[PDB]
């Protein structure tokens, strides 16, 4: 459906290199929500490299149209490549793009797209503008969209000594009772990651606060050997 020359070049090049054999197990691993061309990350990045160097990288003022057109293509590689492209415009992404990122988060949703938007792009935005947290995180948690909820839990994933323990546990406190696999796993993930910096605090939270068994188990798996 796309006019942008760059997206058209990319689509032609990727489609030329599809592998129906490599596609089948890729699509299975994503529970068949998406068609795949069958191009693994390294080749995908290389094929994107080719098109970028051939075409040169588009003006940063196009970045949104490029990503949106890619996001509308049926094959999952196009959304993976759209986030690789987004990374090439990192320095031009700022607080004004949070609504654009929310859109990506709730469109063609799955952990593979959401996990590449949240801890990196949104993580850095809220580190720079932590005053905008109140305008988003409570709204996302209240949404009943599990991907926005997952976004609230993971935006701090890579914060290390910058982690706001108070907000983190407040978030996890609102979401612990969720039936949702992707919420339970995200909770366990951020707890295990945070435990790399502050294990004792994670251990005490997990030992004294309600969690789903999946979340608890995922949280302590690399630190249980210490207590």
Beta bridge partners of 35: 75
Sequence-ordered strand ranges (E) for the chain: none
Question: CB within 8 A of 160, min separation 6: which ones?
Answer: 196, 197
Least Cα distance to 13 among 47, 44, 45 occurs for: 47
Technique behind the model: X-ray
Binding-site residues = 144
| Most distant CA pair in the chain, distance | 59
Cβ(168)–Cβ(156) below 8 Å: yes
Residue ranges and CATH numbers for the domains of the chain are 1-227 (1.25.10.90)
Q: Which residues are annotated as a binding site for Ca(2+)?
A: 144
**Counts of helices then strands in the chain (DSSP H, E):** 14, 0
Whether 163 and 123 have beta carbons less than 8 Å apart is answered as no
Cα distance between residue 55 and residue 177, in whole Å: 49
**CA-atom Rg of the chain in angstroms:** 19
């Amino acid at each position: 459906v796309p006019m942008h020359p760059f997206v058209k070049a990319l689509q032609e090049h990727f489609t030329a290199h599809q592998n129906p054999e490599k596609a089948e197990p890729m699509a299975r691993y994503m529970k068949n929500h998406f068609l795949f061309l069958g191009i693994q990350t390294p080749e995908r990045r290389q094929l994107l490299k080719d098109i970028i160097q051939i075409h040169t990288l588009p003006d940063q003022k196009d970045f949104q149209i490029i990503i949106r057109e890619l996001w509308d293509l049926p094959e999952r590689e196009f959304q993976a490549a759209a986030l690789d492209i987004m990374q090439k415009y990192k320095k031009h992404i700022n607080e004004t793009h949070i609504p654009f990122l929310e859109e990506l988060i709730v469109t063609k949703s799955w952990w593979d797209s959401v996990d590449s938007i949240v801890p990196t792009f949104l993580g850095d935005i809220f580190l720079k503008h932590p005053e905008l947290i109140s305008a988003y995180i409570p709204k996302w948690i209240a949404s009943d969209n599990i991907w926005l909820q997952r976004a609230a839990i993971l935006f701090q994933l890579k914060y290390k000594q910058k982690m706001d323990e108070e907000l983190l546990f407040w978030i996890i406190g609102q979401l612990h009772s969720s039936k949702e696999f992707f919420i339970q796993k995200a909770i366990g993930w951020v707890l295990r990651e945070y435990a790399k910096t502050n294990p004792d605090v994670v251990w005490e939270y997990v030992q004294n606060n309600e969690l789903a068994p999946l979340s608890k188990r995922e949280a302590i798996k690399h630190i249980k050997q210490n207590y």
